[PDB]
Design an enzyme around this catalytic site. Structure first.
Site, short mmCIF file in Angstrom:
data_model
loop_
_atom_site.label_atom_id
_atom_site.label_comp_id
_atom_site.label_asym_id
_atom_site.label_seq_id
_atom_site.Cartn_x
_atom_site.Cartn_y
_atom_site.Cartn_z
N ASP A 85 0.83 -1.19 0.00
CA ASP A 85 0.00 0.00 0.00
C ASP A 85 0.87 1.25 0.00
OD1 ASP A 85 -1.83 2.18 0.95
OD2 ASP A 85 -3.24 0.51 1.11
N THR A 108 -3.99 5.64 -3.46
CA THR A 108 -2.94 6.35 -2.74
C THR A 108 -1.65 6.43 -3.55
OG1 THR A 108 -3.89 5.65 -0.64
CG2 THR A 108 -1.64 6.45 -0.62
N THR A 109 -1.28 5.36 -4.25
CA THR A 109 -0.09 5.42 -5.10
C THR A 109 -0.34 6.30 -6.32
OG1 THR A 109 0.33 3.15 -4.38
CG2 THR A 109 1.70 4.02 -6.15
N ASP A 162 -9.33 -1.40 2.62
CA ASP A 162 -9.46 -0.78 1.31
C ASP A 162 -10.74 -1.22 0.62
OD1 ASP A 162 -7.06 0.82 1.18
OD2 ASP A 162 -5.92 -1.04 0.95
N1 LIG Z 1 -6.59 -6.45 -13.88
C1 LIG Z 1 -6.15 -5.20 -14.15
N2 LIG Z 1 -5.68 -4.86 -15.37
C2 LIG Z 1 -5.24 -3.62 -15.64
N3 LIG Z 1 -5.22 -2.62 -14.75
C3 LIG Z 1 -5.66 -2.82 -13.49
C4 LIG Z 1 -6.16 -4.15 -13.11
N4 LIG Z 1 -6.52 -4.06 -11.82
C5 LIG Z 1 -6.28 -2.80 -11.41
N5 LIG Z 1 -5.76 -2.06 -12.40
C6 LIG Z 1 -5.37 -0.63 -12.31
O1 LIG Z 1 -4.44 -0.45 -11.25
C7 LIG Z 1 -4.75 0.72 -10.50
C8 LIG Z 1 -4.75 0.37 -9.02
O2 LIG Z 1 -3.42 0.36 -8.53
P1 LIG Z 1 -3.20 0.14 -6.96
O3 LIG Z 1 -2.00 -0.76 -6.74
O4 LIG Z 1 -4.54 -0.20 -6.36
O5 LIG Z 1 -2.83 1.64 -6.52
P2 LIG Z 1 -3.65 2.36 -5.34
O6 LIG Z 1 -3.49 1.43 -4.17
O7 LIG Z 1 -2.96 3.69 -5.18
O8 LIG Z 1 -5.05 2.46 -5.89
C9 LIG Z 1 -6.13 1.18 -10.93
O9 LIG Z 1 -6.03 2.49 -11.51
C10 LIG Z 1 -6.59 0.20 -11.98
O10 LIG Z 1 -7.05 0.92 -13.13
#
Ligand SMILES: Nc1ncnc2c1ncn2[C@@H]1O[C@H](COP(=O)(O)OP(=O)(O)O)[C@@H](O)[C@H]1O
Ligand SMILES: Nc1ncnc2c1ncn2[C@@H]1O[C@H](COP(=O)(O)OP(=O)(O)O)[C@@H](O)[C@H]1O
Ligand SMILES: Nc1ncnc2c1ncn2[C@@H]1O[C@H](COP(=O)(O)OP(=O)(O)O)[C@@H](O)[C@H]1O
Ligand SMILES: [Mg+2]
Ligand SMILES: [Mg+2]
Ligand SMILES: [Mg+2]
Lengths: 533, 527, 55, 526, 48
Positions: free
Chosen positions: D58, D91-92, D389
């Protein structure tokens, strides 16, 4: 190319001050060497010809004695394996009361021979199995080696003869007199009921007149004086009070609420009259000696003096309980006069001086009672302490004799016979365990060897003569101490006998300690840090 | 150096292959330390604390706690093993070995350029297949005395000396069968474990009652009562202070005496209630009265009770209330407002044992005690601790075997079969996760390897012999620690807990997957 | 079992719920920190210190 | 120490150096967690100064454990905390976006453009970003359980709990749904207080579940009390059940003999009176936040009542919500409706070597406990963070039924919309507008980089695809690194999360651009 | 080196048993002379 880095893995994850010893030559051999060193330090104090050692602890307190348990206790042993052997010795001391040096010497010899067996090619498991088998064989053999039994414990002469051997190792110069003293003290204790209590024997140490002036008293001696004017009673009627010899007060909070002048005038007079009535009621029951565990009020002391009552104060509750046991009184919790069954009786209570010490004596005329006291005289405090240790050894020997009356010959006979029998048994046992069994048998030679070395003669000649004599079949023959040349003599005739339970427990504990030390493979020592206590 | 070091100059960072190498090195070091622990042929270890206390043990959790390690991956593995010990009470050494072998096998492929994610996917697939096979291979049976004895022996032999293990096996099996209630969870709190330090280590036994580490404080109370009534109470019998700052006021010595005599009436009323009950239940002198109080008893009440031939114990343990209620069969009392004979426990023999300064009270010969005690005996302190740890492990093993109607063959047979099944299932996995499946199978193959190595036999030759025998016969054959030949674990009686194996698989796979996916280790909390 | 401080664990995982740092004091800093302006604990060490610093 | 207008420890720096340093510090903060975004992210091990270990991926958890000296990094960390507290996700993304906008702003700052122009362009761009995000959003039907589960799955697929995605989604959805409350015309969720997450190391994570009630680490005060009650009537209390002192000083003065025993007897009688007042309602379980006297325990057991003492206030409130009871301080004022009826089972069972109290059969409970059983403490902490989350995402989508395509589709669509909007500006501020619009491509670029595919080819293909009319839902497959339509892949995000992320990133860029001087060294001067 | 270590190891046994080192040395010298004799006895010639 100038430094050797620490190997990756556990060698790098170790703490800054920790140590890790693993393997045979790095852990097992080192532990064996440390235990052998400890046995070497304690070896010279074995037997009647043992030598006292001046040991000064971290508190600058001087100990001079040849008692192995005391020496080990006063030493700051740091090696964990030697610590384990010391725990085994202390356990032997607690269980029996004698044989600590035997335990230490046997454990050291066993570990040395185990190291030899490991070097010649044997494994730790095989050595342990052979040692266990040989210990079982020794425990099986030992009852067959019993030469005689106590057969009487109320007799002074028999008890003295039995206890002479136990207190011959300590104070070898004069053991007959100490044997007589301890025999009389133990015979006074130990009534018709078969239970014997060690704590019923009390030792009082007073400087000045040498140990030859020591005596046994049927009663107790307290090293202090009397509060009142009366200093001697001939038909004492002790009444023991656990409460302070004063008018009892409230427990929450006491406030003298005065509202008129008359109450203020009469309060002190009424209090004095009330406590006078209490003391007179105490005295009217025929009581003439009062023992209290608390403080003594000044006015109470005055009114006890007026009625000719002896006042004795005992600070420690243990002394109060022991006095109640030895007189027959019950520790009352209030200032109520004692009932007929709670009134203690003593033949004579008086204040006397021994040397330069003022003592109060509770003396009986009957050769019985619940508690007996041995008065020890001497020219040095350390000498009296050593004599007290010898007395403790004799009392523990008497207790063991009460528990079990079987005796085995001393003076090197018992373990030589055990070694011969175990060696004969091992030669009939095929497999690799025969080497361990033979080494276990040979480890018994460390006792006659130590006795011969302390006596000043050649140990090998004594051992060879003992094997020869036992080969004819004289199983009650040990080495002769009073000889300038290696010689042997019968031990049953000489009365040099040690208790069966002592040998049994010593062998068991020494074998257990040696096996447990052998079982250890890796040592992970933490940083010493602090922790003085 | 890295980005973090710019913001925090005195920070320690390990990125990319550095973090993986650090974690794998730590796991390999822990595994190398704990290899010698596995199996009844394992070697005892000596542990010395800072104060100089000596501890001898073979338990994986105890060794991990007493190891002088300050590594993060070591801390994670120690936490996993701690959870393993807390829930199941067994398999800590196997946990560490499997984690280390998983990490090593994963690194074997990762060093060839493979990404750890594929290895983790293969690990998950292989874990699912292994769990399915474990469900297929468990042996469901009625947990009679023989099976429980076999399980307890299998644990205790690996924990302590063979003869001591044989004694403790009967002890633990009898204790568990004693407290067990039909169709109810086993409450391990009802088995008191008491240590005495005077007899030999083989003198430990089971008492069908309770042992208390304290005795009667009054010297005049009886030292042995044949037929006894047990009164388990939680009522203070010592002097009590008024909560509202009472204080006493008087104007004469006689008034002070009256106030002193009247200030103990409250406790004396309860003492009289107890005495009246004792007189009512046993008007004769044949029967006896024993009072166990969780609160203290002042000397006045002690003397009053002793005057009536009543032995009383004060400051008992809180759990001892329930233990006495279940063993003696009485009713614990928090007040004497209405006490009747039906609230009194029973005990066929009560006596006091003195060991130096310590005083011990024995409550034996109960009718049908639902709570019992194990009296650990030995000549040392480290011996008592070792026996206590072994007894805890055996109790956990027997309780797990009772809870799970099934039991798993030991000696690594189940894991050899699981590895063979994983190898057979490997082609069914699509992609490059087959490498992960192969690594998982090789990781589970560690236990027979370690057993053979500890027993002294050749590792690879014994392993291939076991595998060939299992493939030829299809049975569950494990490593024989005496000869090295294949042996049927079920026939011999080497049993392992099914829950232990399931928890091992789950925890090891989860922690290995989590560690493999770590690509950076940071410490930047300073300044 | 009250002597073993059963509340120790609950205080442990309720303390982590907040991270700033302790002020690092400059010979006259010690003088003028206490000379002016309550209970104050001051740590003396030179670089077990880290554990009590985290505490 | 001659003159010294300012203090000797006061350091001042200003000019281009300050702007460059702030932007570089923000870029470094972004680079710290750049690799922790996307379904193929890798976890990080953080060493707690107190000796603990935090193993997570996270963004907020990683940044919160990092101590920095440059105040721009402090601002970025505060931004991460704000994003975590507001919506609980993205958050990222906000950190990465802020870093990218600050970099593209440094681009113009190297030239002769004043920061105010860049700030105004950023604000106009942010307004257009909000408008486009609202335009390209789609509604969601909250009554559809399957689509709610799909949303939660798309939220949690980037975390370590994604393996047990179905179980995690069901747990989060059930907890959020049952903790939802409605009173006095006011709607609330309150995941912070209720829906407590209790983690017990050991067992397997497949055994984790959310209970229809509350579970606490408590045991009965006396063994004779029942450990299993079918349909308990629970009464909650605050005041102790023991004789306590009054507030005023109340010294007594005893003169007669019988007053001491009378006082003690009245203490006992007061305890009995309190117990009778409790018993008058005929309950089965009594819970108190404070101690219960032994005499009180006896008087309660005489009526066959199980009593538990020393319960935390939050736990008592949770129990009150679950079983429909009201905490009462004065037992004499206890009334019928305060008795908690609605709990369907109470059971004190042993887990591991500890006793846990279960109230786990309530009908229509407004509070719950999520029982997490896992491999270790750190793994359970990470699982708890992931489930937090998930619950935050569920609450956000329940409050706002709008939905936005994910996987980089939204960023590229908004960037394209802003590009064709900036095509007709004809000003000097069009360049920063276009630059901050194209800075949104850092999210698909980061997804591709973490997936391992070719960044340049994939971004070029995505940009070409987004130039068509109906292509706003086209993004990158983070697991295969290929262009795919998100109405087939199924990745979706709440509109609130995207709006908050965009707003926070743009405002962070503005705040750090507004600054051109740094002074430090002065004391607090309290 | 190994032989000297072993000989001193076996000499320590007799040193600890009240045997003066001179007797041990005399026995060692006799043993060495007989070793020389035995080694010369079991030797074989070689055609260079
Ligand atoms: N299966 C997937 N394929 C492509 N992109 C994805 C998939 N799952 C999530 N994402 C993308 O990854 C991002 C989420 O990243 P994440 O590690 O959750 O960062 P944060 O914790 O800051 O939200 C989202 O913007 C989403 O669009
Ligand atoms: N008069 C004696 N002649 C020969 N041996 C004796 C004599 N008295 C005692 N011993 C031997 O001394 C040994 C006692 O040694 P001791 O110093 O008491 O060690 P420990 O206190 O450990 O028993 C006994 O085994 C006994 O055989
Ligand atoms: N008599 C035996 N013969 C062969 N294998 C055994 C025997 N007893 C135990 N084992 C094996 O040893 C393992 C137990 O090792 P142990 O030291 O208990 O590790 P842990 O403490 O981690 O469980 C079990 O998996 C079992 O299969
Ligand atoms: Mg002796
Ligand atoms: Mg085990
Ligand atoms: Mg996210």
């Amino acid at each position: 190319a100038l430094h050797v880095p620490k190997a990756p893995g556990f060698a790098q994850m170790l703490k800054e001050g920790a140590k890790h010893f693993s393997g045979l030559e790095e852990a097992v051999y080192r532990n064996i060497q440390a235990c052998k060193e400890l046995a070497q330090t304690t070896r010279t104090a074995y037997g009647p010809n043992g030598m006292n050692k001046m040991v000064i602890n971290h508190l600058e307190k001087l100990f001079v004695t040849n008692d192995a348990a005391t020496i080990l206790r006063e030493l700051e042993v740091q090696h964990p394996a030697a610590k384990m052997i010391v725990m085994a010795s202390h356990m032997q001391e607690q269980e029996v009361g004698d044989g600590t040096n035997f335990v230490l010497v046997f454990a050291g010899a066993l570990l040395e021979l185990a190291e030899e067996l490991l070097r010649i090619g044997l494994s730790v498991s095989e050595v342990i199995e052979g040692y266990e088998i040989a210990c079982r064989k020794a425990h099986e053999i030992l009852p067959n080696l019993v030469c005689c039994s106590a057969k009487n414990l109320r007799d002074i002469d028999e008890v003295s003869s039995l206890l002479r051997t136990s207190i011959m190792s300590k104070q070898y110069g004069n053991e007959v007199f100490l044997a007589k003293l301890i025999a009389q003290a133990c015979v006074s204790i130990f009534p018709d009921s078969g239970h014997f209590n060690v704590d019923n024997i009390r030792v009082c140490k007073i400087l000045g007149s040498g140990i030859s002036s020591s005596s046994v008293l049927h009663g107790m001696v307290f090293k202090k004086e009397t509060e009142g004017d009366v200093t001697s009673v001939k038909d004492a009627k002790i009444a023991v009070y656990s409460c302070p010899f004063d008018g009892m007060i409230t427990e929450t909070k006491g406030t003298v609420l005065i509202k008129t002048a008359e109450e203020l005038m009469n309060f002190s007079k009424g209090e004095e009259n009330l406590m006078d009535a209490q003391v007179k009621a105490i005295a009217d029951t025929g009581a003439n000696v009062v023992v209290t565990g608390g403080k003594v009020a000044d006015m109470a002391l005055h009114y006890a003096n007026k009625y000719n009552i002896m006042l004795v104060r005992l600070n420690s509750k243990w002394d109060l309980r022991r006095l109640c046991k030895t007189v027959g009184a019950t520790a009352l919790p209030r200032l109520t006069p004692p009932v007929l069954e709670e009134m203690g009786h003593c033949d004579s209570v008086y204040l006397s001086e021994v040397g330069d010490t003022q003592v109060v004596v509770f003396k009986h005329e009957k050769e019985d009672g619940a508690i007996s006291t041995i008065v020890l005289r001497g020219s040095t405090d350390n000498l009296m302490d050593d004599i007290e240790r010898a007395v403790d050894d004799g009392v523990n020997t008497f207790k063991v004799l009460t528990r079990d009356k079987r005796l085995v010959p001393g003076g090197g006979a018992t373990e030589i016979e055990l070694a011969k029998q175990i060696t004969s048994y091992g030669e009939t046992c095929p497999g690799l365990e025969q080497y361990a069994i033979k080494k276990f048998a040979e480890a018994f030679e460390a006792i006659p060897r130590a006795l011969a070395e302390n006596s000043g003669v050649k140990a090998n000649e004594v051992i060879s003569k003992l094997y020869a004599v036992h080969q004819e079949g004289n199983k009650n023959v040990g080495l002769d101490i009073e000889a300038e040349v290696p010689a042997v003599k019968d031990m049953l005739e000489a009365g040099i006998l040690d208790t069966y339970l002592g040998k049994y427990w010593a062998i068991k504990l020494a074998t257990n300690a040696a096996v447990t030390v052998l079982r250890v493979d890796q040592i992970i020592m933490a940083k010493p840090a602090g922790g003085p206590k | 150096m890295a980005a973090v070091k710019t913001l925090n100059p005195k920070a320690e960072v390990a990125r990319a292959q550095a973090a993986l190498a650090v974690n794998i090195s730590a796991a390999r070091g822990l595994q190398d330390v704990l290899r010698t622990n596995l199996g009844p042929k394992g070697t005892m270890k000596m542990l010395v604390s800072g104060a100089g206390d000596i501890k001898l043990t073979k338990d994986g959790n105890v060794l991990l706690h007493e190891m002088q390690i300050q590594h993060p991956t070591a801390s994670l593995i120690a936490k996993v093993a701690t959870a393993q010990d807390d829930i199941t009470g067994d398999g800590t050494t196997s946990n560490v070995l499997i984690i280390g072998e998983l990490l090593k096998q994963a690194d074997l492929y990762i060093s060839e350029g493979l990404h750890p994610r594929i290895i983790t996917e293969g690990f998950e697939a292989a874990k699912e297949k292994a769990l399915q096979f474990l469900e297929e291979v468990k042996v469901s049976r009625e947990m009679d005395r023989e099976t429980l004895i076999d399980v307890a022996r299998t644990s205790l032999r690996t924990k302590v000396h063979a003869e001591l293990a044989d004694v403790l096996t009967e002890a633990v099996v009898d204790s568990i069968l004693a407290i067990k209630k039909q169709d109810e969870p086993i409450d391990l709190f009802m088995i008191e474990i008491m240590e005495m330090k005077h007899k030999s280590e083989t003198d430990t036994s089971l008492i069908r009652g309770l042992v208390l580490d304290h005795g009667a404080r009054h010297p005049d109370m009886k030292k042995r009562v044949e037929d006894a009534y047990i009164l388990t109470c939680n009522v203070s019998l010592e002097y009590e202070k008024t909560e509202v700052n009472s204080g006493f006021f008087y104007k004469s010595a006689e008034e002070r005496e009256k106030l002193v005599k009247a200030e103990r009436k409250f406790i004396e009323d309860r003492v009289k209630k107890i005495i009246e009950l004792k007189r009512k239940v046993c008007g004769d002198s044949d029967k006896g009265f024993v009072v166990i109080n969780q609160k203290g008893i002042d000397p006045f009440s002690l003397d009053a009770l002793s005057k009536e031939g009543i032995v009383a114990l004060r400051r008992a343990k809180r759990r001892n209330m329930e233990r006495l209620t279940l063993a003696c069969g009485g009713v614990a009392l928090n007040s004497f407002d209405d006490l009747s004979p039906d609230c009194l426990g029973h005990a066929g023999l009560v006596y006091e044992y003195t060991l130096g300064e310590e005083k011990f009270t024995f409550i034996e010969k109960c009718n049908n005690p639902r709570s019992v005690t194990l009296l650990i005996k030995g000549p040392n302190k480290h011996t008592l601790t070792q026996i206590k740890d072994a007894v805890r492990d055996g109790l956990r093993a027997v309780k797990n075997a009772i809870d799970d109607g099934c039991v798993v063959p030991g000696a690594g047979a189940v894991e050899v079969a699981m590895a063979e099944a994983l190898i057979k299932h490997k082609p069914s996995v699509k992609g490059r996760a087959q490498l992960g499946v192969q690594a998982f199978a090789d990781a589970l193959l560690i236990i027979p390897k370690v057993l053979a190595q500890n027993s002294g036999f050749d590792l690879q030759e014994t392993l291939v012999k076991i595998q060939a025998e299992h493939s030829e016969s299809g049975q569950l054959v494990g490593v024989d620690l005496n000869t090295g030949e294949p042996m049927v674990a079920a026939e011999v009686g080497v049993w392992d807990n099914y829950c232990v194996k399931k928890q091992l698989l789950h925890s090891c796979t989860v922690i290995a997957t989590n560690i493999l996916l770590v690509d950076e280790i940071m410490r930047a909390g300073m300044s | 079992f009250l002597q073993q401080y059963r509340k120790q664990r609950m205080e442990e995982m309720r303390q982590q719920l907040h991270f700033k740092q302790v002020f690092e004091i400059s010979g006259e800093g010690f003088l003028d920190m206490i000379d002016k302006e309550i209970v104050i604990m001051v740590h003396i060490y030179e670089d077990g210190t880290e554990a009590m610093n985290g505490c | 120490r001659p003159v010294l207008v300012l203090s000797q420890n006061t350091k001042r720096e200003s000019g281009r150096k300050v702007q460059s340093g702030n932007i570089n510090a923000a870029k470094t903060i972004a680079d710290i967690i750049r690799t922790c975004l996307g379904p193929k992210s890798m976890m990080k091990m953080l060493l707690d100064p107190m000796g603990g270990i935090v193993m997570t991926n996270d963004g907020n958890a990683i940044l919160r454990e990092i101590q920095v000296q440059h105040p721009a990094a402090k601002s970025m960390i505060e931004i991460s905390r704000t994003q975590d507290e507001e919506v609980g996700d993205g958050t990222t993304s906000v950190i990465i976006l802020a870093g990218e906008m600050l970099s593209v702003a440094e681009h113009f700052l190297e030239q002769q453009m004043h920061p105010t122009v860049v700030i105004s362009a950023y604000r106009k761009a942010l307004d257009d970003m909000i408008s486009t995000l609202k335009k390209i959003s789609i509604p969601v039907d909250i009554s559809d359980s399957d689509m709610m589960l799909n949303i939660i799955n798309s939220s949690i697929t980037t975390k370590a709990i994604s393996r047990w995605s179905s179980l995690a989604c069901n747990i989060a959805l059930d907890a959020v749904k049952m903790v939802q409350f409605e009173e006095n015309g006011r709607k609330e969720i309150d995941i912070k207080k209720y829906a407590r997450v209790e983690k017990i190391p050991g067992g397997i994570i497949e055994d984790s579940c959310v209970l229809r009630g509350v579970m606490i680490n408590k045991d009965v005060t006396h063994p004779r009390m029942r450990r299993y009650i079918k349909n308990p009537r629970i009464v909650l209390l605050d005041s102790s059940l023991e004789y306590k002192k009054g507030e005023s000083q109340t010294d007594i003065e005893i003169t007669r003999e019988e007053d001491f025993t009378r006082i003690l007897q009245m203490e006992e009688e007061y305890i009995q009176q309190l117990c009778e007042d409790i018993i008058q309602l005929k309950p089965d379980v009594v819970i108190t936040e404070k101690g219960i006297s032994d005499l009180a325990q006896h008087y309660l057991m005489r009526a066959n009542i199980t009593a538990i003492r020393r319960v935390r206030k939050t736990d008592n409130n949770r129990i009150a919500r679950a079983c429909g009871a009201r905490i009462v301080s004065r037992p004499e004022e206890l009334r019928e409706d305060d008795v908690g009826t609605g709990a369907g089972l109470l059971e004190i069972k042993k887990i591991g070597d500890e006793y846990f109290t279960f109230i786990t059969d309530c009908k229509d409970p407004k509070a719950c406990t999520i029982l997490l059983r896992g491999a270790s403490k750190e793994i359970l902490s990470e699982v708890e963070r992931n489930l937090q989350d998930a619950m935050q995402v569920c609450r956000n989508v329940l409050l706002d039924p709008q939905l936005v395509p994910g996987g980089g589709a939204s960023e590229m669509a908004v960037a394209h919309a802003l590009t064709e909007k900036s095509k007709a500006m004809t000003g000097v501020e069009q360049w920063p507008y276009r630059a901050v619009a194209q800075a949104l491509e850092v999210i698909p670029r980061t997804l591709i980089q973490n997936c391992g595919a070719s960044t340049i080819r994939l971004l070029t293909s995505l940009r070409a695809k987004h130039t068509q009319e109906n292509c706003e839902t086209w993004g990158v497959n983070g697991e295969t690194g290929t262009l795919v339509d998100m109405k087939e892949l199924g990745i979706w995000e709440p509109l609130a999360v995207k709006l908050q992320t965009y707003k926070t990133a743009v405002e962070t860029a503005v705040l750090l651009l507004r600054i051109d001087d740094i002074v430090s060294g002065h004391k607090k001067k309290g």
